Amino acid sequence: ATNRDQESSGFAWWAGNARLINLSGKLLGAHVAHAGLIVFWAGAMTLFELAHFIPEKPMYEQGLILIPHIATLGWGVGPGGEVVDTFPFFVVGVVHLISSAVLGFGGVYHAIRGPETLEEYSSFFGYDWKDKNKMTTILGFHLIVLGIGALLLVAKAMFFGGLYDTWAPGGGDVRVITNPTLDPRVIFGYLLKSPFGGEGWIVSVNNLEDVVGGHIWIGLICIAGGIWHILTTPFGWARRAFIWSGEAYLSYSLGALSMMGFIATCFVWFNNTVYPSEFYGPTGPEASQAQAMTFLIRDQKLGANVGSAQGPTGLGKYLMRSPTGEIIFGGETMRFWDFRGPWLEPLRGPNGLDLNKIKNDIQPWQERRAAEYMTHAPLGSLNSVGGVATEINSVNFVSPRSWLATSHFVLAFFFLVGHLWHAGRARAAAAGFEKGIDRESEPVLSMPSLD
Amino acid sequence: METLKITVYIVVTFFVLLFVFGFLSGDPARNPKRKDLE
Amino acid sequence: ERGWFDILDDWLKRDRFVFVGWSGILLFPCAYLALGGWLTGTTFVTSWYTHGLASSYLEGCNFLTVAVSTPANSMGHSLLLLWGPEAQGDFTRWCQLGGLWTFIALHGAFGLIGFMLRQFEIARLVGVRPYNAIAFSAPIAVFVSVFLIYPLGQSSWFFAPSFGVAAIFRFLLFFQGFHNWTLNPFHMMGVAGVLGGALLCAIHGATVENTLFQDGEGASTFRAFNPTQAEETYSMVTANRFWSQIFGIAFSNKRWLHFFMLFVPVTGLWMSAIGVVGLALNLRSYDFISQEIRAAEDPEFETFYTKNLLLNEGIRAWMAPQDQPHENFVFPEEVLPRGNAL
Amino acid sequence: TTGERPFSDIITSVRYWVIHSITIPALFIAGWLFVSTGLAYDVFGTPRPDSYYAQEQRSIPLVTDRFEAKQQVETFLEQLK
Amino acid sequence: AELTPEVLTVPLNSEGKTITLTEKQYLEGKRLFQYACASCHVGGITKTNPSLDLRTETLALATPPRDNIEGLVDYMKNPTTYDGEQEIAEVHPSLRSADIFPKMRNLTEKDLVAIAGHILVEPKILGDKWGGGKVYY
Amino acid sequence: ANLWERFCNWVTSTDNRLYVGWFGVIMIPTLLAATICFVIAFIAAPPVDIDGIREPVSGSLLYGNNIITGAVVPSSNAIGLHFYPIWEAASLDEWLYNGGPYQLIIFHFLLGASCYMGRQWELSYRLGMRPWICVAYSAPLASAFAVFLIYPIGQGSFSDGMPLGISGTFNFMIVFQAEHNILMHPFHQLGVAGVFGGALFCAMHGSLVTSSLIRETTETESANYGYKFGQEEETYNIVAAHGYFGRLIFQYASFNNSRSLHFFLAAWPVVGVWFAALGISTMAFNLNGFNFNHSVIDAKGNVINTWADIINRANLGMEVMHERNAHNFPLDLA
Ligand code: CLA
Ligand code: CLA
Ligand code: CLA
Ligand code: CLA
Ligand code: CLA
Ligand code: CLA
Ligand SMILES: CC1=C(/C=C/C(C)=C/C=C/C(C)=C/C=C/C=C(C)/C=C/C=C(C)/C=C/C2=C(C)CCCC2(C)C)C(C)(C)CCC1
Ligand SMILES: CCCCCCCCCCCCO[C@@H]1O[C@H](CO)[C@@H](O[C@H]2O[C@H](CO)[C@@H](O)[C@H](O)[C@H]2O)[C@H](O)[C@H]1O
Ligand code: OEX
Ligand SMILES: [Cl-]
Ligand SMILES: [Cl-]
Ligand SMILES: [Cl-]
Ligand SMILES: [Fe+2]
């Protein structure tokens, strides 16, 4: 039992995994088994969702988060996101669940039976954290792998059925992407967009051509970068900038993951393109706007002239101007005027919401959709009672957008905390005082008084 | 307003550059003990 | 001089797993009955006859909504003793009238007396100064002001806090709507003492933990301490320099530091208690007169203070009929205060 | 230490479990029956689901007099036919 | 108080005929109503048009009358405006529009009767709460 | 040494009365800007249309406020999450009417405090200390982010960020309770356990250490003179403190390890406050407190109220009254 107590390893049981830092075989084991756990959850959770799935209720009324991910890719769904075949969901679930067995088998093997260290066994699979070239090489393999992944998304979109497109002419539907956006001004133009209202950085991506082209760029970039890191070793400036240790690299990755988590939170909250409202429910903005729409429709049917209706504050009861003059829905939803969705856009002209189109061209499907979305707003309790906080029990509903956003904020935050922890520790340990101050060499004691 | 904007952009850029080039100026070695961390 | 008193004294102070003491004669039965009353009431006992509420696991409440509720308003400040004139020795009727509320409040009070006497007794036996008991004076001021003096100032025990999670939440909101308690500078000093105390706890713990001397070889550093050691386990000098440079001022005297850690949360709780004594009499910090004069004359003048009062008015009107059933409030819909649409 | 047998000794001994494998389930069953027989309701005076209101009544049985409170509760109870 | 057969007895039609729902029917009616209707009609109100509720008095004053089993079943088949003047299947869930309101696709005649029974029985239990909105919460 | 090198040596110098550092290089201008703008605005800013309904709210002292009622008022609902720097306004008068000071202050502040945390790391490293004081500070910092940035993001407007003032703080709390039932949320409850617990343990530790101070002084002088800055020996007898506390409860409920004890003092309030922050940050996306409205029902189906329903009535009062002129449609959906 090499290194499996505090006295020999220096780490207590509650930090026991830190005993693995220089044990590449067992560490490989931990990693592979963990990957196994992830894939296991994907499979099992998918089969659970499918078992509980009623094809004629919206997905979002049923607590689904993975089936929406599958349906977004174009599998199992048809016009307007209606389920036409549940078999691909079944396939996805079963295949992940079976793969998890292979992964776990490997993980357990390397973890308790295989070589505890790999260096003596193989120069190729062996590594020293402090070997910069080897680090950049493994990094490179993994970048090529990620690039390939992005390219698989591309291949699905272009050659194997396409993607679900909430924006398809005539109504949302599955669509093959034939002309992906390759122009770098567009692609990287997203990257330089402000993250504030009406701009929204990369979260603002609103068409699949841009999504797909973006993935072509990321695929090539990752493969190229992978090759670069396989062929090179870090330059002097990098060498002097970073800490080179396992715990350091881990901390860097924790920072990256935290950042990505906050990003995904905002994506699932605001974006209704790669997270179609057909599957995930309406966004908060969307449902608010939809309320406005619903009452405009009702009151106008009653005979109200909604363009000239002055509300109690002096602002339009139904319609008002944005700070730059565009015609928008009034009331509190004035905040959500940057919202865009296929059910609303046919009412939009060059200056914003168009009064003539409003008076003359609103179709029954728009009324239906606005009602649906208004009454599936992402508000609800921890015990999944749908609606505002004061609503009575009756409707069993918490929006998938809320589950995903909240979960990923919690995770992203704790991951920032973890970054601080491991970065600070990595610094202290590399400098040699992570276990405390040397009584015979206390740095402050050799410093001049502050006063 | 435009003069204000350019001014502020320049100030922000200046300090951000100080931050970045500063942390790039051999920071791991700025500690009381083991300095050679390259 | 070895009589029965001294023999009993001997027995009471045996160094056993759970120390007893003379104070234990008061403390143990009273604490046991208070906890037992609460567990008994929240598991089995209703508040149908006192409040018109379900309040027990038996009725379908969960841990957040169970409570031992106060007696009906019509009971006034009756001690509501089981053998008293109200229940007349009838246990079932006593539970239905809210006798468990006063049982728990009173046994709990004597129990807290017992606990502080315990802090004194043990300090005296071991030979340390009695600052722990002294610091415990703040929980006592809080319990006494909130659970006894406050309802004694009001119409009845009904308006005391009921013993339960959600019930306590209701107490908070009631105090906002009726007393504007957040506006009270005594409450505010309480807040400063509680959050300042939490701040001191955190910052002190973290400082000690991050100025430790390396007193062992292990990367887990807890083992490198020995209770009997003479030496400080962390550097006050390094701690001092760090904080002087970070925040501008720092502790330099450990005795003062620890006293301050007593002083801050204890003083905060004491101030909150004083404000609650005022609320016992509806002697509130509800308004700023200058604000009200200006606002009444000028329909364009608006502050966060006036906004909060509109919220309070909403709370009173919408919560009163069900929260104060003995008043038999019937508020027709048309009199209910509401903004547009909602 | 203070003289009493260490807990870890006790709860890892065969005798402890010979006693407590009987005493622990017995207490649990007793508590169950306390509810399942309906005794609890009668002991504490807690309304069963069919005893909060009479069939057509929608007003709470609130106690309104301190010294005749017992009789009021008895009257409320009688009013459930 | 109990859920008696009397409470569960409601008008079948406008001609004085009544039907008595089983407890299982009552439960089924609550379940199906939550399933297909509560998203808009929780508590007896109507979120997308609060002017019209599900109170028995309101339904009685509808055209054609909607305060009986037949009236309600028909409404779930071919809903109209309050005056009976327009058919609104295109914007309100119904069997007729089960193509665009897919949750109506599996509702059977038995189910519709259960939902109707729910809508009629609930105010006998809850009184003003039913159709009352937040004021009565 | 060249100029850049000397500058670097000064910036990172351990000998400055207040440490500067690279994080400090960002912290110092940002915190000054927020501070100066906050002071001027608090005293002299005209009323701000917080809810975008042309209903300006007065926050400043010169415009009819005292210390308790005063605030720097959040930016206009018409603005939402749009970035509204001074140069986006046609004039300062406009900037002021729409609540520009609020955005200037909170953005400079959040950046500056993020840098304050970084700086705590940085100095810990220059001094040869262990690094985690900054992690402790992450708890109040995350909380500020929650109420100044995350909640606005989730709700779609900085108009719903916490106001910079005392009464404005209370307003934010009451509205939050109406809209999320925060009291019935377990993360807020963990927050309360964290701060109540922190105050408790603060008092406890204070009192135990104070109780066990070793006699080094006479009765006519403060016991504090018995400790001298930088002395090597501990100033109280921990074995005695533990002898007391272990007997107050039982032996194995008391800490005998000072390191373990101080770790606990750090962890309890820090974790609790982390959850407080996460409560606000998840309710930001409208995953709210437990809802048991009408959970208890009798045999006929009558609602039997619990304390949860009374809470509900209070919440309704708050809900129907807040922003009395801003809603035109029946549901408040943000
Ligand atoms: C994802 C979670 C995870 C994973 C993958 C690991 C992995 C590992 N841990 Mg860590 N650990 C974890 C969480 C995890 N840990 C947690 C939460 C704690 C706190 C309790 C610890 C505390 C801890 C300590 C103190 C130590 C480790 C050690 C180890 C390593 C050696 C294990 C060993 O020798 O056990 C021997 C165990 C057995 C022989 C029992 C059975 C173990 C197998 C794996 C169970 C497999 C069951 C599975 C269902 C089988 C499916 C097979 C099928 C696919 C065919 C291993 C790489 C040790 C180490 O670093 O040594 C170098 C070590 O000292 N861990
Ligand atoms: C990304 C993470 C994630 C998200 C967003 C969801 C979302 C959902 N799940 Mg899924 N699920 C997950 C992971 C997730 N799950 C995991 C890990 C499992 C294995 C246990 C499952 C197994 C599962 C089942 C069996 C079911 C769901 C269901 C659901 C739905 C209802 C959830 C609910 O009511 O929660 C209730 C809320 C809680 C239980 C609160 C959890 C609070 C945690 C413990 C706080 C943790 C904080 C932090 C991580 C700790 C840090 C500590 C600090 C000191 C560092 C909802 C769509 C249900 C459904 O509707 O299916 C159709 C359902 O039946 N899930
Ligand atoms: C990234 C994960 C990973 C890594 C780096 C390793 C590395 C190693 N394994 Mg382990 N192992 C793993 C996962 C991994 N394994 C899994 C998942 C299983 C269960 C199948 C095992 C079961 C296992 C056993 C039983 C043994 C090893 C052995 C070895 C060593 C010999 C490798 C060799 O010579 O192959 C030579 C190269 C090949 C044979 C070509 C492999 C062709 C691959 C599989 C095609 C697929 C590639 C594609 C990119 C995979 C994508 C997967 C993704 C979708 C999840 C080497 C250290 C041996 C050992 O430790 O001896 C001391 C050994 O006996 N492995
Ligand atoms: C720049 C990287 C990037 C970005 C912005 C996206 C974005 C997206 N992906 Mg794609 N994808 C990527 C890489 C990326 N992906 C990679 C590497 C793979 C292979 C694993 C995929 C495979 C994939 C599939 C199969 C699918 C998507 C989908 C999506 C969309 C929904 C998912 C989401 O919310 O992710 C949010 C994205 C992030 C949180 C990542 C942001 C990364 C930041 C900007 C950079 C971090 C860089 C790092 C820290 C710095 C390196 C260090 C260096 C400086 C030294 C969304 C537009 C779904 C879709 O399109 O539906 C139709 C979908 O089905 N992606
Ligand atoms: C996970 C992916 C990953 C990781 C961990 C690394 C890691 C590394 N890369 Mg590699 N690289 C990658 C992918 C990755 N790379 C890819 C995909 C490509 C193809 C584009 C490259 C191409 C590449 C080149 C050409 C070089 C590196 C180099 C390096 C090394 C130093 C990098 C550095 O100092 O960053 C820290 C970043 C800086 C110091 C930049 C300055 C700081 C600015 C202000 C950061 C601002 C970013 C901003 C916050 C991002 C927010 C979004 C924004 C886009 C709006 C480091 C080992 C360098 C090296 O040493 O090669 C041997 C180098 O010369 N990489
Ligand atoms: C030992 C600690 C202790 C203390 C301080 C208390 C205190 C209290 N109990 Mg609790 N109780 C205890 C232990 C204790 N109890 C135990 C062990 C039990 C289980 C049997 C109970 C069960 C219990 C119940 C069921 C009730 C109380 C109640 C009370 C309250 C009213 C007591 C009273 O009026 O006594 C009056 C009696 C004395 C003060 C005795 C004084 C002794 C004198 C000085 C000696 C002289 C006596 C004299 C010679 C005798 C002549 C009698 C003759 C004329 C007939 C009071 C707060 C009541 C309550 O809480 O109502 C809400 C209540 O209903 N207690
Ligand atoms: C290392 C270690 C660890 C960990 C471990 C792990 C993590 C493992 C994993 C493992 C795994 C990861 C496993 C997996 C498995 C899986 C499986 C075994 C599967 C199976 C499947 C099946 C059998 C299927 C079936 C089916 C079908 C096919 C159809 C449908 C239906 C059903 C589902 C029935 C611990 C922590 C303990 C500690 C110590 C060390
Ligand atoms: C967007 C912002 C700009 C980003 C640019 C990033 C490009 C990556 C390379 C940047 C250049 C790095 O250049 C880096 O800075 C200065 C420049 O003299 C060097 O010089 C430094 O060296 C030593 C290291 O002990 C320091 O003590 C000394 O104060 C300083 O002169 C660093 O050793 C060098 O590594
Ligand atoms: O802003 Mn401030 O407060 Ca959040 O809900 Mn909506 O909006 Mn307004 O109402 Mn309720
Ligand atoms: Cl009406
Ligand atoms: Cl308000
Ligand atoms: Cl509105
Ligand atoms: Fe201390």
UniProtKB/Swiss-Prot annotation, chain B:
Sequence ranges on the Lumenal membrane side:
1-7
Its biological function? One of the components of the core complex of photosystem II (PSII), required for its stability and/or assembly. PSII is a light-driven water:plastoquinone oxidoreductase that uses light energy to abstract electrons from H(2)O, generating O(2) and a proton gradient subsequently used for ATP formation. It consists of a core antenna complex that captures photons, and an electron transfer chain that converts photonic excitation into a charge separation.
Record PTM Blocked amino end (Met), positions in chain: 1
Give the record's membrane topology: Single-pass membrane protein
Cellular component annotations (GO), alphabetically ordered: photosystem II reaction center; plasma membrane-derived thylakoid membrane
Give its localization. Answer: Cellular thylakoid membrane
Output the InterPro entries linked to this UniProt entry: PSII_PsbI, PSII_PsbI_sf
Keywords linked to the UniProt accession: Membrane, Photosynthesis, Photosystem II, Reaction center, Thylakoid, Transmembrane, Transmembrane helix
Q: How is the cofactor bound?
A: PSII binds multiple chlorophylls, carotenoids and specific lipids.
Do the record's keywords include Thylakoid?
yes
| GO annotation terms (biological process) | photosynthesis
Chief location category: membrane
Membrane-crossing ranges are 8-24
Q: Which family does it belong to?
A: Belongs to the PsbI family.
Q: How does it assemble?
A: PSII is composed of 1 copy each of membrane proteins PsbA, PsbB, PsbC, PsbD, PsbE, PsbF, PsbH, PsbI, PsbJ, PsbK, PsbL, PsbM, PsbT, PsbX, PsbY, PsbZ, Psb30/Ycf12, peripheral proteins PsbO, CyanoQ (PsbQ), PsbU, PsbV and a large number of cofactors. It forms dimeric complexes.
Pfam families named in the record: PsbI
| Protein name, entry field | Photosystem II reaction center protein I
**Which of the residues are on side Cytoplasmic?**
25-38
Which species expresses this protein natively?
Answer: Thermostichus vulcanus (Synechococcus vulcanus)
Swiss-Prot record, chain C:
In this chain, pheophytin a is annotated as bound at: 119, 132
Provide the membrane-side ranges marked Lumenal in the record.
Answer: 51-113, 156-196, 285-342
The alphabetized UniProt keywords are: Chlorophyll, Chromophore, Electron transport, Iron, Magnesium, Membrane, Metal-binding, Oxidoreductase, Photosynthesis, Photosystem II, Thylakoid, Transmembrane, Transmembrane helix, Transport
**Annotated GO biological process:** photosynthetic electron transport in photosystem II
Tell me the subunit arrangement.
PSII is composed of 1 copy each of membrane proteins PsbA, PsbB, PsbC, PsbD, PsbE, PsbF, PsbH, PsbI, PsbJ, PsbK, PsbL, PsbM, PsbT, PsbX, PsbY, PsbZ, Psb30/Ycf12, peripheral proteins PsbO, CyanoQ (PsbQ), PsbU, PsbV and a large number of cofactors. It forms dimeric complexes.
The record ties this protein, via NCBIfam families, to: psbD (TIGR01152)
Identify this protein by name.
Photosystem II D2 protein
Question: Which gene does this sequence derive from?
Answer: psbD
UniProtKB/Swiss-Prot annotation, chain D:
Q: Gene3D superfamilies annotated for this entry?
A: Photosystem II cytochrome b559, alpha subunit
Give the source's domain of life in one word. Bacteria
Annotated GO molecular function terms are: electron transfer activity; heme binding; iron ion binding
The main location class comes to: membrane
Topological domains on the Lumenal side lie at 33-81
Q: Which InterPro entries match?
A: PSII_cyt_b559_asu, PSII_cyt_b559_asu_sf, PSII_cyt_b559_CS, PSII_cyt_b559_N, PSII_cytb559_asu_lum
A Gene Ontology cellular-component term: photosystem II reaction center
NCBIfam families the record matches: cyt_b559_alpha (TIGR01332)
Q: What is this protein called?
A: Cytochrome b559 subunit alpha
Originating gene: psbE
From Swiss-Prot, chain E:
The terms under GO molecular function for this entry are:
electron transfer activity; heme binding; iron ion binding
Q: Which purpose does this protein serve, as stated in its record?
A: One of the extrinsic, lumenal subunits of photosystem II (PSII). PSII is a light-driven water plastoquinone oxidoreductase, using light energy to abstract electrons from H(2)O, generating a proton gradient subsequently used for ATP formation. The extrinsic proteins stabilize the structure of photosystem II oxygen-evolving complex (OEC), the ion environment of oxygen evolution and protect the OEC against heat-induced inactivation. Low-potential cytochrome c that plays a role in the OEC of PSII. Binds to PSII in the absence of other extrinsic proteins; required for binding of the PsbU protein to photosystem II. In PSII particles without oxygen-evolving activity, maximal activity is restored only by binding of cytochrome c550, PsbU and the 33 kDa PsbO protein.
Give the domain of life.
Bacteria
Indicate the family of this protein: Belongs to the cytochrome c family. PsbV subfamily.
Q: Which residues bind heme c?
A: 37, 40-41, 92
The GO biological-process annotations, alphabetized, read as: photosynthesis, light reaction; respiratory electron transport chain
UniProt keyword terms in alphabetical order:
Electron transport, Heme, Iron, Membrane, Metal-binding, Photosynthesis, Photosystem II, Signal, Thylakoid, Transport
| Main localisation | membrane
GO CC entries: photosystem II; plasma membrane-derived thylakoid membrane
In Swiss-Prot or TrEMBL terms, this protein is called Photosystem II extrinsic protein V
Q: Would the keyword Metal-binding turn up in this protein's UniProt record?
A: yes
Give the record's membrane topology: Peripheral membrane protein
Cofactors named for this entry:
heme c
Q: Where in the cell is it found?
A: Cellular thylakoid membrane
Q: Which gene encodes it?
A: psbV
